[PDB]
Design goal:
Chain C: Belongs to the glycosyl hydrolase. This is part of a larger assembly, with 4 copies of chain A. In chain A, the strands form 6 sheets. In chain A, strands 6, 7, 8, 9, 11, 12, 14, 15, 19 and 20 form a 10-stranded antiparallel beta sheet that branches. Chain A has a 7-stranded parallel beta sheet with strand order 28-27-26-23-22-21-29. The first copy, chain A, is an alpha+beta fold. The two termini of chain A are 42 Å apart. The longest helix of chain A is centred in the last third of the chain and has 19 residues, at 500-518. Chain A is globular, with a radius of gyration of 28 Å. Chains in contact: A-B, A-C, A-D, B-C, B-D, C-D. The interface between A and B is large, with 74 and 73 residues.
Chain lengths: 754, 754, 183, 191
Amino acid sequence: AVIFHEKTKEFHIFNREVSYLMRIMENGQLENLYYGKVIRDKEDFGYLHEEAMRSQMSVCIPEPGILSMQYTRQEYPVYGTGDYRSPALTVLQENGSRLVDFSYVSHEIYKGKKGIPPLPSTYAESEDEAETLEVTLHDQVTDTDLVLTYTIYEDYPVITRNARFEQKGEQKIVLERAMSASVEFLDMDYELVQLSGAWSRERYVKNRKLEMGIQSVHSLNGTCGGAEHNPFIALKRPQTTENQGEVYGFSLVYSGNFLAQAEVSTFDMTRVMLGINPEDFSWELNQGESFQTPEVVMVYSDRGLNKMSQAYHRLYRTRLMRVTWRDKARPILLNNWEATYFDFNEEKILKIAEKAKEAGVELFVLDDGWFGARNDDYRGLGDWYVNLEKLPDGIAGLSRKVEALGLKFGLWVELEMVNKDSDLYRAHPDWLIGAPDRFESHARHQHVLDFSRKEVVDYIYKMIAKVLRESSISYIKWDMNRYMTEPYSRGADASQQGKVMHKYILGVYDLYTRLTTEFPEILFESCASGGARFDPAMLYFAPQTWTSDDTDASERTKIQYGTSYVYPVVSMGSHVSAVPNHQMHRMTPIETRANVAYFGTFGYELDLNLLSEAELESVKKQIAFMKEYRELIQVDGDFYRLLSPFEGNETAWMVVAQDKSRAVAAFYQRMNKVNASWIRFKLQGLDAGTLYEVSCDMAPSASYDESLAKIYGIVKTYRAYGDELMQVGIPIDREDLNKKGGDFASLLYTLKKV
Amino acid sequence: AVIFHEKTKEFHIFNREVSYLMRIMENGQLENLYYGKVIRDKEDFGYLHEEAMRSQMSVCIPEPGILSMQYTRQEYPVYGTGDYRSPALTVLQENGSRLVDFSYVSHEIYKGKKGIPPLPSTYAESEDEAETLEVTLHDQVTDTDLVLTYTIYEDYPVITRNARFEQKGEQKIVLERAMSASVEFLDMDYELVQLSGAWSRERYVKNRKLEMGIQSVHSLNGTCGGAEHNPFIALKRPQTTENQGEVYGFSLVYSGNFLAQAEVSTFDMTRVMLGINPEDFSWELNQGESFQTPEVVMVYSDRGLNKMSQAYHRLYRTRLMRVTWRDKARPILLNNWEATYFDFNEEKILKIAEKAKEAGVELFVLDDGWFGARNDDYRGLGDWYVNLEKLPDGIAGLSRKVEALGLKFGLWVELEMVNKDSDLYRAHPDWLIGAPDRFESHARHQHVLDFSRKEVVDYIYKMIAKVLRESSISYIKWDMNRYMTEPYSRGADASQQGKVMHKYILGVYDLYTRLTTEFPEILFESCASGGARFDPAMLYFAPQTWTSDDTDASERTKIQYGTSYVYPVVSMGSHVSAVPNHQMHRMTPIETRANVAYFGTFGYELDLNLLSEAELESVKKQIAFMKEYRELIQVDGDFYRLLSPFEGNETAWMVVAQDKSRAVAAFYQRMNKVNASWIRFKLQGLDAGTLYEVSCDMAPSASYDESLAKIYGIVKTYRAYGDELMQVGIPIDREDLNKKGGDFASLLYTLKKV
Amino acid sequence: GSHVSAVPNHQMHRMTPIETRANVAYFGTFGYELDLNLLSEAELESVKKQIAFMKEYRELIQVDGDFYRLLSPFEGNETAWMVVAQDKSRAVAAFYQRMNKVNASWIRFKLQGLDAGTLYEVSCDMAPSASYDESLAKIYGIQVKTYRAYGDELMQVGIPIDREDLNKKGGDFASLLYTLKKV
Amino acid sequence: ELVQLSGAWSRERYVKNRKLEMGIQSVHSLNGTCGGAEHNPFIALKRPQTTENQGEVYGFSLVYSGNFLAQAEVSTFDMTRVMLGINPEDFSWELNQGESFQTPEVVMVYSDRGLNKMSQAYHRLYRTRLMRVTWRDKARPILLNNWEATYFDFNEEKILKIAEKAKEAGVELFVLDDGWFGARNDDYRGL
């Protein structure tokens, strides 16, 4: 709902769960009054705004009145007129001044949502789902206008904001900074929650306590958001638990350079902003030209972090992904990277795909080594045609044979980069990104292809569109392992640099749109070396991504616990792999790897013919279990986090159906403890007054000397109510998880209605 | 000492306390290797630079080598070549690109210190007292050169850093960000200390813990550094107290917009930068033009915060203040601001000064109201003649009469601001600092002038030297009560509009230089609304500063505790005010007011003829004590902080002579406790083995009631050793400070060698 | 059991406004350990007005009503509590300060124990004390509260506190008392 | 976390919180004639993240006005035991044939919505089920005391001028506080 209160000049936006208030000042500005849980509205709310007479305070209205921007909560601030806090807008004019002033003109209210066509966003399937308010402000000196757009979703506590700039005069202006949102609070008793990491260790949860000054996260990686920081921010009280408290969450729909900032002043006032990085941003606007900023999604919860995470999960599963895969279950596949990184051939492949049919696999994906002359990591990239010295029948023959075996087919592609020895560099090397007379840095023997121009991307498409047309492909994986250096473009005027780092992202979005439009029957897999581009803007284009290049049950729980704060379980991609690890070289039980891999998308990175017959029968049961339970696990259910691996030695989570009639729970341990305490296990989301039955499997696997447990002197179905399973819990015996391997151990429990 | 080690291309700078190591890498850049406590020197140190291969890492040298700027410690970095942290330099060129590469060319070593003429800086008397190193770097694409200057102070653990840019080509460049120093550390187990506050509460000490991301403090006030944050940053270990631990301190010699930033990466690498705020800064350089940045002074201590603060005190007293007031004791003065507001004649001024001559006062100061039509706060500012209605005798006659009475004379000026009702605005309104077709904000009914324009500085210099030449003045107080807003200059071009704030600061420096040079016998008092511009820069021209405008017996025990971290005691001003305060309206004993006002520059703001005879004796005793002990307190003496008011209820400091032969200590209490514990007072700076005698004065206050004490049944001197006073302490009786007033009580102790 | 004593109290030797002493003595058994032949004429009239309040509200304060603690004096500078009736139709709230703050932030006094959906009327009397310098405020430029609200808007959004009304109540140990009626 | 009330004369019952660790944490009384102003016979165990409005807490109180001991022991297997009772410092009770001994009562209250709910439960129980029926739900009168008005120095004519004055104000009860009995002019004789 949206109401105006024309006699008082206010705005109240609310649904069954949240409220947002604002009003128009006497100098034509919009200023915040309240943002939080829902309240009833009345005609006048004027007492919530108060004025004082401080010292060193400069007023922006004529002499009789008193009003300052340093002591007020305003939406979309600006610098240079009495507010000495970090601004959100910066416009440069022809006389050399940076001074702007936008005043209220008109407003408009309607039902539904728009598309912000250049960029992705969330959509609405009906006219009764969302409501939208647009406010127009005008700058008379430079003759420009600014539109602020707010959208409210019903059935969720979800608010989205964006801003658009229009230029109408004969003058030209320059934008040097343009944030998307700004939210202000009257106190500082909060804590900032963020997700930070690096390669092979991504998205670890970190907490900081707010203090006067500035705290921020940023990304200057150019070609992606980076594995260092993730564009997500949370503000929570210091006494907020997974199932009680009060928390605000802000997410940005963008996959480029970003800045997220929280500034606390010396009068206990907090300001939070999110947007594009102004490091190398300079957008020139001429007569009849427009600019649109990314979208910011904010969610408020008053019952812990689980509720906020569930709001994100449902919203991103239902109102962001395409309707083709909204209510579908992902297949089970097998990759050859770990088994065969580079040295392979059709024959060595027709024996791996042959063995992975009795187990139950349904997709086979090839990897690097099938194009130009790529035998090593220094040659052949950019030549997207079939190598005939490894696949004599070509890709068409191999795909035909694989489909004849009863499987499906998939390929690997990296349509953004080039090597020096390829034909693309010899034909015309002026399509690279760089500057004249400057050295050209090299990451992995490869350089970026300048998508800021339309001619290059076009060529790219054709060279690959054919590969899809001749053969019968059903799955593609797009890898990208390089950052952007020296952002200069050959095809641009001296007043066109500064747009390249945004035009590149726009071009990659255009390429995705073309490929998805032509082939709406192909599942896409995004990959930035394993989790450097997990931004939702990609989830809008590719339904699932590769979470991380770790594949260690010990380290993947740590990564997935952090990832699940904002991103749904379906998005995360997981695989089971060999035991002598390559990244950590640690060895784990085969049942632990399977247990960790269940909560996501199942898959294998193994050589199924090298395993022993006493484990090629565990792979057959794992696949059966996964294809029995994937319907509950992926598309229909709620995710609860129960124990934190960041504080303690154990991890535990569970997933529950929407009607509370079926659930599965998992409990993992890190290090073996000797002569320790009794351990319980309490569950969270169930129904008191129901009579679930609990089932577990305690099969003692290999690596158990029952002949030594004798010297030291050392039925699974029970039926209980939701009450007992919540307050009391499930007793865990430390002797049981010693037969499961001891060091890294896991347990799954399955609950049933009656 | 500076040594080269040509065979290995290194640089070792050391003295008896600290060491700094650096070297030239294989791409012509400077790399930091070690900074800290002194170590002996060998020929080779190259094994301290470690490099390893990682993923997503781009090298900047030819293919066979491995060198990434993300995982190396470098001085004065830059963005766009393989580094994804915050840069320290941004240059914009005519082709539109921002890409620079500076390579080492030559170096020079000499003895002494230069002057960096446009800005104030520390000097070295004679030579053999300091040593200087200059490194020259050149870029071939733009033909611009950079000079980095390092200076080591012998006898102190002090290192100073600065930089300079020179343009040698036929083109023009635009500097958009320029920092003075950049230091890197290999870990992040540190704590950040800062001084933050507001009006009437300045420089409160605040500690923060380092976390991945950015922690920064800035200032955007334009005309000053402001009361919100101070240009000083310290890094300390978490277990560091006043007398043990390790700490690094950084201070910036500049009185304008500043930025101090600490950036922690995901690999546990910390980077600290200080410099000018790049918010609205853009400097254009043509052929034969140079740019000079402010200076950074950095200090290391390994024995607690007291040693660091003492290093600052000694350096800023002996090498920054002018030689005229370097070894003198400040006079005792009487002010009249709080005695009368805007309401005085030639006659009331004589009576208030006649009485304060038998007490022992030696200087009299006249405040705002003597010039123009300054009958209220609305008008009269800008024209600087004598209001003949109020003073028919004039400033000259008043000064002669005061000198006849046996005192000296002082005046109050504000040479930066104007009123609309003054003659200066009616004559010509084009000298205000503002933009066309924009509303002009007003702070206290006043506006700022464009010091940037010299025609204005020339007009202001006259009409003021006339007053200082006609009469016999000996004291001037300069007050500033308006910040800079809408920074536009009518006397400029479309370019060079981003140089207004720096030029304004340079212009005020020039005016100070003129006034000081042409009147070398006048003491200047700098008061930017009561502690908004306090910094070494202002100390280069005005030897003392008005600390705050609160004048509370308490409150000032928390503003001076925080202030004493970096600035010497002789700088801070301290006066006595009326018993019912004008700011907090609380009542304090006079003895506490005197005992707080001692540790600064003693003064009075009372009306001495409205006090009682029991009070005119106390004032005489106070004056005698101060003029007996001011030589020890101000000129020669070390300041020790004993007990903190930010953690606890009591405050305590003391000052000791330089040969451990005399000392005075104080103890302050905030709240009164009933039925509490025994309290001991441990001193910290003395000489073990000496036999001081300790003396105190204990005379009950007039408010103490004795007939009530007998119902509830409820000068000193003794000899002790230094160690007994340092490990055991002085036992304070909790009924002793119940006779001092009870609520806000204080005690003084004097120690003697015999 | 709580009483009201003479201003320079015999235990701590501290001066406190009489209305703060009355406000702290209301939550308990009201009493007077005082002598009324020593009080001034402008202060004897202020004592008769406290007895009427206590005789009017003691039934709600003592025999029927829940006690909620809102702010903690062991964690900050201010104290705050309140008493609510059993059917949620009347309430009394009290706010106390320890030290005066200069140039400080805003205050939002958040209540508890009421019910959303009920329209309450809030009243307070911010009468100045006898130790107020008006001209001092004049030269600084800084020179019948009944209003209606809802139950949820009082617990989720606070009552705005104006720090200038805490400076004319004594300033150092100032206190405020609010009355809520279901009408 | 353990919550207790500790203080002294003129400063009683300040709230103090401790974090449990393997060992013993206790509070006792040894004054003999009373529980003393130092510690009060009340103990709370609360979760570390418990506010006045959310979280779970257990409160134990002991109905006894003499020596007491309240103890909480944590073993090396993360097991916590809480005990309350009489202090065994000088306690030694001899029982013969046909003799019995009785211990004081312990009241325990559990809440899961902060501390206000537990405190309210205690207030209601102590008001309705502990105090005598005659003064259970009445309003206490307004009294005037003269200890800090006269101390030991007063007479009959001194107090009848106080009582007359405190009748116009609205007081309804007067209390003498000391010195009334013979030989009472200081704190040395007459008791």
